[PDB]
Design a protein around this ligand. Structure first.
Ligand code: 7XU
Ligand code: CL
Length: 310
């Protein structure tokens, strides 16, 4: 196979300061932070994710593996790893996304969320997924929760902890495809099914899937031929696309490139495909933004605009 020549970058702790805790879960906590490269004189807003001071080795293999994947991908619609800090315990530095995860975002802003936005995200997510397919990577955990908003217009995929190379030996039941659920079989197409759910989450503005239903339950339910309900705002076409994602035969499921194309068409005439009350009225925020508490963000540069050789 091809050699991975991605460069892994190591950063001194002195380089960045962690302002706040974005979230804490399990043994891992993520902080909003500012990173300054050594001679660069640029300030970068970053998220630092560190697994616990507890340094259990099993965990470490896990965090490092995720970083390896993140280091290895370049796309507008996929999150990438800025570098790593080895002090005390490994931490991952990646560009901060100000608006947080999409799933939270839909729930919070649902009244103000446009049809055009929903389709665009749908298109954007597909583009990111397609890139991974190009890189032969199976995310193996795509969810609305795992999509981050740089801006309302722009979103990218993340959480590559579960990611594996295709055909490699090497738990979100609801997202998971049936083949994966029954047989622990994962393929991009398995990935595609997950995308369909993600679309469903967005379409319903963050509604839970198979809500009130136990996970053990799900395999049979799927077995029956049951599937998620058409969302109220979903036109028959848009829904129909979703259903294809949930097909028993994976080869039957639509390819990611195909998905990008179909949604893209809809985005031209968003109103036709999604019906929302007051669609015209809604508008959404943009970035200065200075979310971090700094007087001096003259030099702030986004990670997207911050580049290094190779
Ligand atoms: C209503 N609240 C909800 C929480 N909130 C918020 C959360 C995240 C962000 N942005 C942001 N950016 C990059 C991230 N990279 C990882 N995670 C991450 C994963 C792998 C490597 C490095 C970072 N995260 C995690 C995703 C899980 C939840 C905590 C933030 C990230 N989060 C901005 C605001 C403030 C508003
Ligand atoms: Cl689940």
């Amino acid at each position: 196979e091809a050699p991975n020549q991605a460069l892994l970058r190591i950063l001194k702790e002195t380089e960045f300061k962690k302002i706040k805790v974005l979230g804490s879960g399990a043994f891992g906590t993520v902080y909003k932070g500012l990173w300054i490269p050594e001679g660069e004189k640029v300030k970068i807003p970053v998220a630092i994710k560190e697994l616990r001071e507890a340094t259990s080795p099993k965990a470490n293999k896990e965090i490092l593996d995720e970083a390896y994947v993140m280091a290895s991908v370049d796309n507008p619609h996929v999150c990438r790893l800025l570098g790593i800090c080895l002090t005390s315990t490994v931490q991952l530095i990646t560009q901060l996304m100000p608006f947080g995860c999409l799933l939270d975002y839909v729930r919070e802003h649902k009244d103000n969320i446009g049809s055009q936005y929903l389709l665009n995200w749908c298109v954007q997510i597909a583009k990111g997924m397609n890139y991974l397919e190009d890189r032969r990577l199976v995310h193996r955990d795509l969810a609305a929760r795992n999509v981050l908003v740089k801006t309302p217009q722009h979103v990218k995929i993340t959480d590559f902890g579960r990611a594996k190379l295709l055909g490699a030996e090497e738990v979100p039941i609801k997202w998971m495809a049936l083949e994966s659920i029954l047989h622990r079989i994962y393929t991009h197409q398995s990935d595609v099914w997950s995308y369909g759910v993600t679309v469903w989450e967005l379409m319903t503005f963050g509604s839970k899937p198979y809500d009130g239903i136990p996970a053990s339950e799900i395999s049979s339910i799927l077995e029956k031929g049951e599937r998620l309900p058409q969302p109220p705002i979903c036109t028959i076409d848009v829904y129909m696309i979703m259903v294809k994602c949930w097909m028993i035969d994976a080869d039957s499921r639509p390819k990611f490139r195909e998905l990008i194309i179909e949604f893209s068409k809809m985005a031209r005439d968003p109103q036709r495909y999604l019906v929302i009350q007051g669609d015209e009225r809604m508008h959404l925020p943009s970035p200065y933004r200075a979310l971090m508490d700094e007087e001096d963000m003259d030099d702030v540069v986004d990670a997207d605009e911050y580049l290094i050789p190779q």
